[PDB]
Amino acid sequence: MAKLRSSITPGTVLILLSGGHRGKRVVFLKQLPSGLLLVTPFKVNGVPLRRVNQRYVIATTTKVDGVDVSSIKDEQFGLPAQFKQLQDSVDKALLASLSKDKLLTQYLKTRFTLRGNMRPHEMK
């Protein structure tokens, strides 16, 4: 199976690099087979529960601390009724916690640009 990197601990903020939600900053829950990252709050970002591949994702030093986690499995993911209810069940704990910090809630909701002068090998 795909090994995790030492950056990605549970909790931590990623950023998505490709697909329909490119740029957006998204918090990591659990590694699933197929070795994919379950990475998910839909009120904040407007991205759902989804499996993102490890290599289309930059990890970040920023982190967040209730959530169900262990029930959800790869049989799920491969307009809908049950999925919308499972979503709002999972983000009970996070919406309470991310009501606190407004620097952190903005940080999720903005999306990451390569802005001109910055060189992404001398990044961090």
């Binding site: 903020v13 950023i15 970040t60 030093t61 920023t62 620097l103 952190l104 903005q106 940080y107 903005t110 990451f112 001398e122 961090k124």
Partner: protein
């Protein structure tokens, strides 16, 4: 003609492996190249560094000529020249370029939220002070 290659002048090392660290002069070898070192805690081992590589700093601690690397450390701790350079400009923006390099993504986000909030208040005074 301020600034002399003399014993115990502070130097920014601009080129070479050290790159960006501070050093003291000990002794002039010949008309090129000088016996540069640091006791600590810059941590540049003593060597025959060329003159081209090293920008001279304003501050010096006065000590006699060829010198043991211990007897810097005693004469350093009284003066604290490395601290006093670091107060002034050039000294400040040297540390800025170290800490800009080491920012996180959230730490880079922090900056631009504060800087834009400043500009709301900056534009309110620029209209008000005009009025």
């Amino acid at each position: 003609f301020t600034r002399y290659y003399q014993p115990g002048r502070l130097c920014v090392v601009q080129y070479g492996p050290d790159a960006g660290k501070l050093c003291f002069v000990v002794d002039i070898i010949n008309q090129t190249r000088v016996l540069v070192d640091g006791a600590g805690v810059t941590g540049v081992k003593r060597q025959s560094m060329p003159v081209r590589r090293i920008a001279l700093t304003d501050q010096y601690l006065k000590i006699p000529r060829s010198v043991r690397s211990a007897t810097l450390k005693k004469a350093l701790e009284k003066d604290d020249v490395i601290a006093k350079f670091n107060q002034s400009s050039w000294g400040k923006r040297r540390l800025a370029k170290e800490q800009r390099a080491n920012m996180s993504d959230f730490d880079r986000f922090k900056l631009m939220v504060i800087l834009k909030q400043r500009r709301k208040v900056m534009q309110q005074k620029l209209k008000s002070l005009k009025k």
